[PDB]
């Protein structure tokens, strides 16, 4: 499904929809199995494959995936910690993004070969941008 | 025990309260006792019931109100509020308004709920460093800022207790300032 | 590291989460899924 995406509006919409549907079906049929962790011969996962291939729409969908179905909600990557009035506080997963893995999404995007279509724009997805700004503000600015 | 009643109200199950009411009546204890609210926070069973709603309805609240009135406790029970420095002063009327529940606020006010309680906790003050939501500090200001026209109309024209329209909060802001 | 929920096996779900805040005036949705009863953070 990741390989088929080509960043067009309809293609992206359907690829995301089918990805979500297959994920839900796999969760219902085999709750124990973790589908998104499986890797191909190159060792990439669907998330890493999308990040490296420059599939911006699929990456944006995956990083902000939010499933409200009670039976299958652990699949979500974005959660609402609390809400009082018009104010919401949300959480992002950062499972394989914070450079503490073999090849995180952030490292894969940063160290692209410039052959990837739109690596310039893949850092505008909310969690990546805010994470980079936080890392810059916390400790690295003084080192620079 | 406080834990049992808290679980019963949170689970929306009022079966256990059938013994709690006679238990409290015979035990000679009052819900206002320190042994029925969190030590550091101060939350009461009524507040937990208000927080834990389902589809906007929680029948257990009616049972708690009935038992409280049966023991003559509504005066100090409905007007209970957080004692924590972070939600200081935050009452049940604020929860009722914030959840957009007209019936709950009507029941609370007609049962003696004060309408001039100030939710002057740190979560409610205007602080740029930390998260929060500033709406003034009074129920009328909360209703106006949270977009409940019917609720503000009701508070101003409440028969049991009308809400003062010129009241000012800690920083002096009125409803218009808020 | 924060608790997000429970795995279908029943164990706890703990994840290294990054927190963001947002404001929305049009929605006014009072019926959604939340993790914490008390809104504020410490």
From Swiss-Prot, chain B:
Keywords assigned by UniProt, alphabetized: ANK repeat, ATP-binding, Calcium, Calcium channel, Calcium transport, Calmodulin-binding, Cell membrane, Cell projection, Glycoprotein, Ion channel, Ion transport, Lipid-binding, Membrane, Metal-binding, Nucleotide-binding, Phosphoprotein, Postsynaptic cell membrane, Repeat, Sodium, Synapse, Transmembrane, Transmembrane helix, Transport
Is Glycoprotein among the key words of this record?
A: yes
Residue ranges the record marks as coiled coil: none
State which tissues express it.
Answer: Predominantly expressed in trigeminal and dorsal root sensory ganglia. Expressed also in hippocampus, cortex, cerebellum, olfactory bulb, mesencephalon and hindbrain. High expression in the cell bodies and dendrites of neurons in the hippocampus and in the cortex. In the brain detected also in astrocytes and pericytes (at protein level). Isoform 1 and isoform 3 are expressed in brain and peripheral blood mononuclear cells.
Q: Which residues carry this modification: Phosphoserine?
A: 4
Q: What is the effect of changing residue 3 to D?
A: Abolishes capsaicin-evoked current and binding to resiniferatoxin
ANK repeats by residue range: 1-26, 41-73, 91-116, 137-164
Stated consequence of mutating residue 4 to A: Abolishes phosphorylation by PKCM and enhances channel response to capsaicin by PKCM
Q: Which GO terms describe its molecular function?
A: ATP binding; calcium channel activity; calmodulin binding; chloride channel regulator activity; excitatory extracellular ligand-gated monoatomic ion channel activity; extracellular ligand-gated monoatomic ion channel activity; identical protein binding; intracellularly gated calcium channel activity
Highest taxon of source? Eukaryota
What does the UniProt record tell us about how this protein is modified after translation? Phosphorylation by PKA reverses capsaicin-induced dephosphorylation at multiple sites, probably including Ser-4 as a major phosphorylation site. Phosphorylation by CAMKII seems to regulate binding to vanilloids. Phosphorylated and modulated by PRKCE, PRKCM and probably PRKCZ. Dephosphorylation by calcineurin seems to lead to receptor desensitization and phosphorylation by CAMKII recovers activity.
Effect of altering residue 48 to A?
Abolishes ATP binding. Abolishes CALM binding
Any idea where this protein resides?
Postsynaptic cell membrane; Cell projection, Dendritic spine membrane; Cell membrane
GO CC annotations, alphabetized: dendrite; dendritic spine membrane; external side of plasma membrane; GABA-ergic synapse; membrane; neuron projection; neuronal cell body; plasma membrane
Keyword Transport belongs to the record: yes
Q: Where does ATP bind?
A: 3, 43, 48, 52, 87-90, 98-99
Question: In the record, which positions carry Phosphothreonine?
Answer: 32
Question: Which GO biological process annotations does it have?
Answer: behavioral response to pain; calcium ion import across plasma membrane; calcium ion transmembrane transport; calcium ion transport; cellular response to acidic pH; cellular response to alkaloid; cellular response to ATP; cellular response to cytokine stimulus
Domain remarks: The association domain (AD) is necessary for self-association.
Q: What else is known?
A: Responses evoked by capsaicin, but not by low pH and heat, can be antagonized by capsazepine.
Family stated for the protein in its record? Belongs to the transient receptor (TC 1.A.4) family. TrpV subfamily. TRPV1 sub-subfamily.
UniProt organism field: Rattus norvegicus (Rat)
Curated annotation (Swiss-Prot), chain C:
Subcellular localization, as worded in the UniProt entry: Postsynaptic cell membrane; Cell projection, Dendritic spine membrane; Cell membrane
> What post-translational modification does the entry describe?
Phosphorylation by CAMKII seems to regulate binding to vanilloids. Phosphorylated and modulated by PRKCE, PRKCM and probably PRKCZ. Dephosphorylation by calcineurin seems to lead to receptor desensitization and phosphorylation by CAMKII recovers activity.
Where on the tree of life does the source sit, at the highest rank? Answer: Eukaryota
* Coiled-coil region: none
Name the tissues where it is expressed. Answer: Predominantly expressed in trigeminal and dorsal root sensory ganglia. Expressed also in hippocampus, cortex, cerebellum, olfactory bulb, mesencephalon and hindbrain. High expression in the cell bodies and dendrites of neurons in the hippocampus and in the cortex. In the brain detected also in astrocytes and pericytes (at protein level). Isoform 1 and isoform 3 are expressed in brain and peripheral blood mononuclear cells.
UniProt function note? Non-selective calcium permeant cation channel involved in detection of noxious chemical and thermal stimuli. Seems to mediate proton influx and may be involved in intracellular acidosis in nociceptive neurons. Involved in mediation of inflammatory pain and hyperalgesia. Sensitized by a phosphatidylinositol second messenger system activated by receptor tyrosine kinases, which involves PKC isozymes and PCL. Activation by vanilloids, like capsaicin, and temperatures higher than 42 degrees Celsius.
> Any miscellaneous information on file?
Responses evoked by capsaicin, but not by low pH and heat, can be antagonized by capsazepine.
What does the annotation say about its assembly with partners? Answer: Homotetramer. Interacts with PIRT. May also form a heteromeric channel with TRPV3. Interacts with CALM, PRKCM and CSK. Interacts with PRKCG and NTRK1, probably by forming a trimeric complex. Interacts with the Scolopendra mutilans RhTx toxin. Interacts with the spider Tau-theraphotoxin-Hs1a. Interacts with TMEM100. Interacts with PACS2.
Protein family per UniProt:
Belongs to the transient receptor (TC 1.A.4) family. TrpV subfamily. TRPV1 sub-subfamily.
**How are the domains described in the entry?**
The association domain (AD) is necessary for self-association.
Output this protein's name.
Transient receptor potential cation channel subfamily V member 1
At the highest ranks, the source species' classification is: Eukaryota, Metazoa, Chordata, Craniata, Vertebrata
Residues represented out of the complete protein: 725 to 766 of 838
